[PDB]
Amino acid sequence: DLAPGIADSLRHFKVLREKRIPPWMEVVLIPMTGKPSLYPGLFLFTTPCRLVRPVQNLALGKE
């Protein structure tokens, strides 16, 4: 019950360039249900070879 808020807080840091979260960290939160969905858990990638793309973040308008 803290994973959603943590993911949203981390996404707000990267968007507003707060803390030291790299502007390009991927905060992923693969939810867990009872179904055979992808393995659950909060990943956070910041490695130097991933592909990224810009999108206008609504609720903040901060790209």
Partner: protein, 51 residues
């Protein structure tokens, strides 16, 4: 005079620091939507027949 195990704790407190959510405004774009291509005013014909 040594250290002995004492009574089991009755509870646990876990502290974390968290900020809150603002209002939903959803300001999608500076100049928004795909603005349509359109007619230059008046224009005028730039060609005539012979005769």
């Amino acid at each position: 005079g040594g250290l002995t195990c004492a009574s089991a704790p009755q509870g646990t407190l876990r502290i974390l620091e968290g900020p809150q959510q603002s209002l939903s405004g959803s300001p999608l774009q500076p100049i928004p939507a795909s603005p349509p291509p359109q007619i230059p005013p008046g224009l005028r014909p730039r060609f005539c027949a012979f005769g």
